[PDB]
Design a protein around this ligand. Structure first.
Ligand code: CHL
Ligand code: CLA
Ligand code: CLA
Ligand code: CLA
Ligand code: CLA
Ligand code: CLA
Ligand code: CLA
Ligand code: CLA
Ligand code: LUT
Ligand code: BCR
Ligand code: LMT
Lengths: 33, 103, 204, 732, 31, 184, 80
């Protein structure tokens, strides 16, 4: 595939970075008084 | 004046004449009893749908019987459909190898 | 904060704000130099002002050194540092000693300065014109360094040779004929269509 | 207290963890949100529909993009019978080197997943040939998704907000949807088939840059306008045509050949074009039925009010039903789900037997996956249809406004309907199970000739009437001198009769006693699932045990242990019970499809014909026999590419089992357990430095039923998908 | 014939714009 | 009583004849809302103006004998690549159209940048507004006719008119549709 | 909190009041029944929703009805 390095970047981003951001932000939203 | 001209024009003329002289009363009184589309006892425009206002051009015509433009499009559409049905069935039955008859 | 202007004044370069009819944010009232009401993602504040100034000031020296190196025949600028561990440590110690006082001044004065000259200006002549020129030249300089890096990535020649090629053939030697042509064209279309979406937000 | 469920102050003031769960579970029940009005409800639904459409188009764009980028579409186009189609690439850092090697398939340079979705066959049939074509389609669909998102945002703005009366204009919406959304879309698709797909099937490269230069037919549009329409049917593709090439190709663009292309084993593209053209004309005509703003057309309220039998057999008939349907979003959603789910089943039944895509019939894994996928989707949708019917009866039904009409009258004999559904379910279960068990005992005692094997003579008679001569019933299309025979003899009957009398396809498979028994099992499943759903809908407003059930809503835990005990009394609980029966029913249906086709694909029809008449035959010769390659996907000797399906197989078994915990053990055990845990944390040093914000509580009664059902269903689906795909693809 | 790097970057950029429009719709639906 | 698109019909109630080109033609009732009607008035003017410029461009290009036809002019080599062309054009038109929308929002009238209305020769009149809107509608219809002639006969507008004038009983829409196999 | 509404079929038997484990209910004077009293629910902030009252009620259909509502610390029966 062209730009074959992209899975090695985007898979950690979508599988680790985005979920960590998402659950941290959603935790902060749903616990906010 | 070809076969296409004859069939399409004759079917359109017959449909327009049938709508103008024969079925105008039947269509008129059925459209009168069925009336405007409703919701909760009100017409759509009375309920607040501004896009559902009756088109002002559609009623007043100057034809003595009240045959308006919408009647012309509807009956001409029926005539064109009938004429093309006749032309297509004739085209099938005249092409060798095709025979839709059940015997 | 001496980087703040003497008087609030939004300058005019074909318009006042970053597109015609653009609203300015409440936190951008023209007190800052180079203010154009431009913060659409609402990142902004004063720490980011020294961030912009520091990146711009380093970029001035960067573009000046690169242009002077390319003006003579001193090879490519990107291969220049290669033409170790004690040197790394001593440089990091000296620069960290600079940054100790740079960070300490922000806790008290709200500025950075150099060492303890928090308004670092031994020759004075500081005005609103100097502030606006400094911020605009810093922005232009860091755009120029990004241009240097991108032109060296797309073509193996130096920036002086790219300017010569653009002089020689203007319509055929440009960004839209390089490898990054189509995505640059799409970014241009998106950029030119964005403010009408923002005005659709405003009027509706 | 908090601000997360901002649509529900009652949930926002809940101090427990129930607030988060219920805040998620009630987010799309817009009618129950705080301070909602009818107009704002409809506007929110309209924008949500735009969001869903954008998601669908993005999903299609992603499939096209990943096939274009990481797949092997041109290689598959070169050899469609000997290339496994690639779905997407695998980048998993947990892979060992044997897993990297095992999953490298289809000619790929790395580990990939082999597609089971049939997009290769579909995209190839409609004329796409290169990676560039797929990429351009994906970019177009991403732009379409952006347009839909913008329209969703736009119609939420105050000057573009549609009024409530606009949403209730039924006649204009039906006219436009029938004429444009169905009819014009079908006409445009006929345009695509005639200009692009048919020439590409004949080796002619027609794209955007040359389609204004390329003649779709050698005589142009003169036969169309003159009405000499039989010109377009002359010279079809011959029986020796090679798909995608000019060898053996014709020039016809609209035909009625019937049957299949001999090489692709799929429907002729010119037949498909004529189908969609006739559909376009019929739908455009049907979209001129209802009155809008031009003084002509029908009024639906008056149509409904007119249809009351004068003998009084239906009481007031359909009087008042226009306002009942038009004012209830749940009635409309129930109708939409019932019709769409039935259509989904029809798609499943017709795509296996009349495959519309080239080289789909030879792809056995894809055919099995598509049938199973659409039948399970259809089952879930039918459950939802009846669920929203029950919700209509609770929330929206006005008995005074429906006095004496068909709705009130069917409510008035609900005991008769429910009791007759109970009778038919009981009869089918008793006798189908009894015949199977009798046959099992006959096989166990060594005497298979004592089995009760009832010949399905009614369905065989139907197959004979449609032209299958195998059973010896000589009538209609299997009688060579009948009027029905002679009428179709020059148009579609030769291809149809060639296809229906060949046993090498899936068109009207030969059936026998095993098909009889499993069809009666299917009838039992349909009738029992319907019984649960219908009893839930008709008792939704009240029963003798709880005569005021409408006051409590669609979903509530129970009415307590009094009056004998009232667990699972709500209509929601009837939905929950019926999902189990739907999963059971679709399981029987798909088991039948897969096992019969496994015998047909392996060239041994006697295995199904002999073993399916008793249940040990199903267990041993279908489940046990075909699980061998799957469970050896990884073993002590190593692993192969089926190891992902072995792992997912076990994963589904685990999720299924975990659901049983929520379904069997109920709330108060867990609440007392959690109380001891809450004591432990407060008394434990270095841990009682941290405290919860939300008081931990056990999941609610209804929430437990939901979560258990979700685990049960997900495990069910994951297990069967792994078994189906592994068993079919390990052989084929 | 494979796609180019530029085609992948074009698709990713158009998807990023679509995602911005999606965030806009989601926030409008929220409040 | 102004002239109506249909003799002796009642115009819709939102078309009372103040706007230029008001012939009571709104059978679908698209301009029932007033603010949308004003926006559609400006949109009709802008579409008609672009059509007038484009139709004059196609006619002048065929009159001056530019060798590629109007519907094949994009594929011509000009030295300037089309990516650079579309990028510069979008930048310039984005500036001009942002200015035009800002003027329409502030003043409600048409115009060039920072000039609303744009009339240095001071020729604005109600008859002039009627002439502008009628020529714009005619040019919009004419551009659709240009597209039809380019699609069916593969000819420019003056070429198609000369073909029709040379033999009007065989060089019309019927003959051109009948001659699609030899044209295409 | 849960809503406990009383209807007028109540015969004033007091069994629901005796059944209540959190003292939500009480008997108040009335003239609608022979016992000259009717159940009342003044303290539904303390109602846990156990429906012991409905189990105690002898009328057909019920004269005390519990409608489960928004959950609180008291209605969830929490001691922590
Ligand atoms: C809005 C004005 C406008 C209109 C109506 C057209 C219309 C057309 N352009 Mg043009 N273009 C327009 C603006 C521009 N174009 C181009 C660059 C091109 C190129 C490079 C080409 C066209 C071609 C075409 C034709 C496409 C025919 C076809 O096969 O479509 C089927 C769907 C058609 C006549 C092309 C062609 O098809 O004809 C030779 C062609 O190759 N256009 C640029 C860049 C400066 C434009 C600036 O706005
Ligand atoms: C898509 C999601 C994803 C991805 C990309 C990875 C990737 C990885 N996992 Mg797997 N994991 C995941 C989801 C994922 N995990 C989930 C959902 C589970 C539970 C089911 C696991 C359970 C799991 C276990 C039990 C282990 C891994 C390990 C690994 C590593 C194996 C490769 C290696 O040899 O590293 C060797 C490791 C290194 C070279 C050091 C890497 C250090 C990283 C780069 C630090 C990054 C900083 C951190 C992310 C900061 C977070 C900030 C903020 C985003 C929150 C690799 C980093 C193994 C391990 O090595 O990780 C510790 C390991 O033991 N994972
Ligand atoms: C609203 C649209 C519209 C209108 C106003 C008409 C009107 C007409 N059509 Mg039809 N047409 C239409 C849509 C329309 N058409 C469409 C969409 C198609 C494509 C299928 C056609 C294709 C078509 C054909 C092929 C023919 C017509 C003919 C005619 C004419 C019949 C007049 C007559 O009385 O014959 C007089 C009849 C005798 C003297 C006998 C008339 C001008 C016919 C015509 O031109 O000659 C008769 C004819 O042959 N039209
Ligand atoms: C500091 C601003 C600046 C200036 C004066 C230049 C100058 C030049 N660039 Mg570079 N460039 C810049 C920033 C700049 N660039 C940035 C930020 C990038 C990364 C996106 C690039 C990446 C780049 C590439 C990949 C190429 C050029 C090329 C060129 C040549 C002009 C033709 C062209 O493609 O227009 C560039 C168009 C732009 C919109 C660049 C941004 C310029 C900003 C907006 C300032 C504009 C000021 C101006 C007066 C108006 C010329 C030598 C070509 C080349 O090197 O010779 C053949 C070429 O292929 N540039
Ligand atoms: C002899 C003359 C004749 C006949 C045979 C009919 C027959 C019919 N008319 Mg009447 N009609 C007539 C004269 C006649 N009509 C005249 C002269 C007029 C004046 C013009 C009308 C005006 C009229 C109107 C306005 C309507 C009818 C309708 C009907 C239908 C229903 C009538 C009814 O009461 O159903 C009684 C039905 C029930 C009581 C319910 C039975 C439900 C069963 C038991 C359910 C079984 C389900 C099954 C077990 C599950 C599946 C089975 C499995 C094997 C698949 C029926 C087709 C109605 C209609 O349906 O039109 C299409 C209607 O709206 N008619
Ligand atoms: C076009 C399809 C469609 C639409 C627009 C709706 C819309 C709605 N449904 Mg119906 N439904 C559907 C199809 C649909 N459903 C299908 C296929 C089923 C069968 C599974 C159901 C069965 C169903 C039930 C049983 C209920 C609804 C409910 C609802 C409402 C709230 C949903 C919610 O907040 O869930 C939130 C969903 C989650 C938090 C995820 C749940 C776990 C998933 C599966 C993972 C909303 C009006 C509820 C209602 O209206 O209350 C009266 C309700 O109780 N739906
Ligand atoms: C294998 C599992 C299984 C079986 C056999 C049944 C059986 C039945 N279900 Mg139950 N169901 C199941 C799983 C099952 N269900 C699960 C997991 C759920 C989710 C909770 C449900 C939820 C459910 C609902 C919601 C409903 C049913 C109903 C039915 C009946 C369907 C009609 C029928 O087939 O009558 C035939 C009866 C049978 C096949 C039962 C077995 C009969 C035996 C074999 C008779 C012989 C007994 C033997 C001689 C006695 C020996 C005793 C010994 C000690 C001496 C039937 C009683 C429906 C109903 O009640 O309709 C009437 C109904 O509404 N089911
Ligand atoms: C087809 C997919 C689809 C669509 C069209 C919607 C549409 C909507 N949802 Mg639903 N949602 C979905 C999938 C979807 N959702 C899924 C899979 C879940 C998990 C089961 C949810 C759970 C959910 C909750 C809990 C809420 C919504 C709300 C909303 C509304 C605003 C969404 C938003 O972006 O706020 C943007 C707001 C923020 C980013 C800040 C607040 C964070 C919110 C409160 C939670 C995040 C919501 C978001 C949709 C979660 C995505 C789930 C993800 C796994 C796909 C809008 C009507 C919210 C609304 O108020 O109800 C009407 C709301 O509270 N959704
Ligand atoms: C009002 C009414 C109302 C009711 O209610 C309804 C209804 C009926 C719907 C309506 C009607 C209407 C009308 C018809 C509309 C249409 C239109 C169009 C025509 C426009 C255009 C418009 C068109 C325009 C823009 C344009 C033009 C274009 C131009 C620029 C360009 C050109 C050219 C040039 C020069 C040259 C080259 O080489 C090429 C080109 C480049 C190509
Ligand atoms: C005035 C007058 C008159 C009249 C006449 C005329 C003028 C008429 C005309 C009319 C007409 C002449 C009409 C027409 C119409 C038509 C139409 C309206 C059409 C339509 C069509 C369609 C709709 C089609 C469709 C289709 C297609 C497209 C394809 C194929 C299929 C079909 C066929 C379906 C008279 C003499 C009496 C008297 C005096 C005065
Ligand atoms: C198929 C049958 C074909 C028949 C149609 C052809 C015959 C009719 C064509 C003659 C049309 C004359 O069109 C005529 O235009 C003028 C302006 O131009 C309109 O005139 C209107 O605008 C003018 C100009 O500001 C003002 O004087 C005034 O506001 C009003 O009269 C008339 O209301 C209309 O009648």
């Amino acid at each position: 595939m062209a730009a074959a390095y992209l899975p090695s970047v985007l898979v950690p981003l979508v599988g680790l970075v985005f979920p960590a951001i998402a659950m941290a932000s959603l935790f902060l939203y749903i616990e906010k008084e | 004046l070809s076969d296409t001209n004859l069939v399409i024009g004759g079917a359109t003329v017959a449909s327009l004449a049938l709508g103008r002289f024969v079925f105008l009363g039947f269509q008129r009184d059925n459209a009168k009893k069925q009336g405007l589309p409703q919701q909760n006892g009100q017409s759509n425009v009375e309920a607040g749908d501004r896009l559902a206002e009756e088109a002002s051009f559609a009623l007043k015509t100057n034809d003595p019987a009240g045959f308006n433009l919408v009647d012309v499009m509807a009956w001409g559409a029926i005539g064109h459909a009938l004429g093309y049905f006749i032309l297509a069935t004739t085209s099938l039955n005249n092409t060798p190898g095709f025979d839709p008859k059940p015997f | 904060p001496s980087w703040l202007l003497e008087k609030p004044n939004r300058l005019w370069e074909l318009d006042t704000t970053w597109y015609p009819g653009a609203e300015p944010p409440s936190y951008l009232d023209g007190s800052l130099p180079g203010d154009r009401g431009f913060d659409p993602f609402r990142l902004a504040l004063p720490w980011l002002v020294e961030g912009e100034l520091y990146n711009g000031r380093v970029a001035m020296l960067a573009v000046a050194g690169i242009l002077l190196v390319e003006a003579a025949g001193l090879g490519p600028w990107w291969s220049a540092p290669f033409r170790y561990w004690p040197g790394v440590v001593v440089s990091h110690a000296i620069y960290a000693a600079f940054e100790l006082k740079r960070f300490d001044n922000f806790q008290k004065y709200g500025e950075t300065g150099l060492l303890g000259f928090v308004p670092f200006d031994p020759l004075n002549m500081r005005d609103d014109y100097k502030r606006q020129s400094e911020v605009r030249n810093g922005r232009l300089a860091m755009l120029a360094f990004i241009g240097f890096c991108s032109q060296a990535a797309n073509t193996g020649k130096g920036p002086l040779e790219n300017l010569k090629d653009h002089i020689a053939d203007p319509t055929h030697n440009n960004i839209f004929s390089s490898g990054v042509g189509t995505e640059v064209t799409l970014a241009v279309i998106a950029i030119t269509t964005i403010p009408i979406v923002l005005e659709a937000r405003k009027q509706l | 207290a908090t601000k997360f469920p901002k649509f529900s102050q009652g949930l926002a003031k809940d101090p427990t963890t129930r607030r988060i769960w219920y805040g998620i579970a009630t987010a799309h029940d817009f009618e129950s949100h705080d301070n909602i009005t009818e107009e704002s409800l409809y506007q929110k639904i309209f924008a949500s529909h735009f969001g869903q459409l954008a998601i669908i188009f993005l999903w299609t764009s992603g499939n096209l993009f990943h096939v274009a980028w990481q797949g092997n579409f041109p290689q598959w186009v070169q050899d469609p019978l000997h290339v496994r189609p690639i779905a997407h690439a695998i980048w998993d850092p947990h892979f060992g080197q044997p897993a990297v090697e095992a999953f490298t398939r289809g000619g790929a340079q790395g580990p990939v997943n082999i597609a089971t979705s049939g997009v290769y066959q579909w995209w190839y049939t409609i004329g796409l040939r290169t990676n560039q074509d797929l990429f351009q389609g994906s970019v177009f669909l991403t732009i379409l998704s952006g347009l839909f998102l913008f329209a969703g945002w736009l119609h939420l703005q105050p000057r573009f907000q549609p009024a409530l009366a606009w949403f209730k204009n039924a006649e204009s919406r039906l006219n436009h949807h029938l004429s444009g959304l169905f009819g014009v879309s079908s006409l445009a698709w006929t345009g695509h088939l005639v200009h692009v797909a048919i020439p590409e099937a004949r080796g002619q490269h027609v794209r955007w840059d040359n389609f204004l230069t390329t003649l779709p037919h050698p005589q142009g549009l003169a036969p169309f306008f003159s009405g000499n329409w039989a010109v377009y049917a002359q010279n079809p593709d011959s029986s020796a045509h090679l798909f995608g090439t000019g060898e053996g190709s014709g020039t016809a663009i609209l035909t009625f050949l019937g049957g299949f292309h001999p090489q692709t084993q799929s429907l002729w593209l010119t037949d498909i074009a004529h189908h969609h053209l006739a559909i376009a004309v019929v739908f455009i005509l049907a979209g001129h039925m209802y009155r809008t703003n031009f003084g002509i057309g029908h009024t639906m309220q008056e149509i409904l009010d007119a249809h009351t039998p004068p003998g009084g057999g239906l009481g007031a008939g359909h009087k008042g039903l226009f306002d009942t349907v038009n004012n209830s979003l749940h009635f409309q959603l129930g109708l939409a789900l019932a019709s769409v789910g039935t259509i989904t089943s029809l798609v499943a039944q017709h795509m296996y037997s009349l495959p519309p895509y080239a080289f789909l019939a030879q792809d056995f894994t894809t055919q099995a996956s598509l049938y199973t996928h659409h039948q399970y989707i259809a089952g879930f949708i039918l459950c939802g249809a009846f669920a929203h019917g029950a919700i209509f009866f609770v929330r929206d039904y006005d008995p005074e406004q429906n006095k004496g009409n068909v709705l009130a009258r069917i409510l008035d004999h609900k005991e008769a309907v429910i009791s007759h559904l109970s009778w038919v379910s009981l009869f089918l279960g008793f006798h189908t199970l009894g015949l199977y068990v009798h046959n099992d005992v006959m096989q166990a005692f060594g005497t298979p000739e004592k089995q009760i094997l009832i010949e399905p003579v009614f369905a065989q008679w139907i197959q004979a009437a449609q032209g299958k001569t195998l059973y010896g019933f000589d009538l209609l299309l299997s009688q060579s001198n009948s009027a029905a025979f002679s009428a179709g003899q020059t148009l579609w009957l030769p291809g149809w009769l060639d296809a229906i009398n060949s046993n090498s396809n899936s068109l009207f498979l030969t059936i026998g006693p095993g098909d009889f028994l499993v069809h009666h099992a299917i009838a039992l499943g349909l009738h029992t699932t319907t019984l649960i759903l219908v009893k839930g809908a008709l008792d939704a407003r009240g029963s003798k045990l709880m005569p005021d059930k409408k006051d409590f809503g669609y979903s509530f835990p129970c009415d307590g242990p009094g009056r004998g005990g009232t667990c699972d009394i709500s209509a929601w609980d009837a939905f929950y019970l019926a999902v189990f029966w739907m999963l059971n029913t679709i399981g029987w249906v798909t088991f039948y499809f897969h096992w019969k086709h496994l015998g047909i694909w392996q060239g041994n029809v006697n295995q199904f014909n002999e073993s399916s008449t008793y249940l040990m035959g199903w267990l041993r010769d279908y489940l046990w026999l075909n699980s061998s390659q799957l469970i050896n996907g990884y073993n002590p000797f190593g692993m192969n590419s089926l190891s992902v399906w072995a792992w997912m197989f076990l994963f589904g078994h685990l999720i299924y089992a975990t659901g049983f915990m929520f379904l069997i053990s109920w709330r108060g055990y867990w609440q007392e357990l959690i109380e001891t845990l809450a004591w432990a944390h407060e008394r434990t040093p270095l841990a009682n430095l941290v405290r919860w914000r939300d008081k931990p509580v056990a999941l609610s009664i209804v929430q437990a039923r939901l979560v258990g059902l979700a685990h049960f269903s997900a495990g069910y689906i994951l297990t069967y998908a792994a078994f189906l795909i592994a068993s079919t693809s390990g052989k084929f | 014939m494979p796609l180019s790097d530029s085609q992948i970057f074009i698709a990713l950029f158009i998807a990023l714009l679509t995602g911005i429009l999606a965030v806009r719709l989601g926030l409008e639906l929220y409040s | 009583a102004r002239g109506l698109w249909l003799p002796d019909t009642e115009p819709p109630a939102h078309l009372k004849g103040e706007l230029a080109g008001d012939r009571g033609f709104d059978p679908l009732g698209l301009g029932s809302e007033p603010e949308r009607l004003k926006w559609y008035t400006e949109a009709e003017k802008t579409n008609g103006r672009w059509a007038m410029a484009g139709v004059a461009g196609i006619l002048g290009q065929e009159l001056l004998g530019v060798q590629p036809k109007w519907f094949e002019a994009g594929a011509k080599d000009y030295g300037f690549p089309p990516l650079a062309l579309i990028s510069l054009e979008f930048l310039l038109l984005g500036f001009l159209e942002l200015k035009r929308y800002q003027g329409f929002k502030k003043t409600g009238k048409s115009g060039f940048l920072d000039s609303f209305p744009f009339d240095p020769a001071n020729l604005d009149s109600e008859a002039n507004a009627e002439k502008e809107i009628k020529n714009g509608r005619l040019a919009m219809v004419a551009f659709v006719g240009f597209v039809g002639a380019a699609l069916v006969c593969r000819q420019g507008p003056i070429e198609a008119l000369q073909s029709h004038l040379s033999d009007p009983f065989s060089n019309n829409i019927i003959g051109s549709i009948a001659r699609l196999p030899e044209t295409i | 909190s849960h809503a406990v509404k009383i209807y007028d079929t109540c015969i004033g038997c007091t069994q629901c009041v005796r059944a209540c484990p959190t003292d939500v209910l009480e008997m108040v004077p009335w003239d609608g029944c022979k016992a000259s009293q009717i159940a009342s629910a003044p303290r539904t902030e303390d109602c846990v929703g156990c429906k012991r009252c409905e189990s105690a009620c002898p009328t057909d259909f019920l004269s005390v009805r519990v409608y489960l509502g928004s959950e609180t610390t008291r209605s969830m029966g929490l001691a922590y």
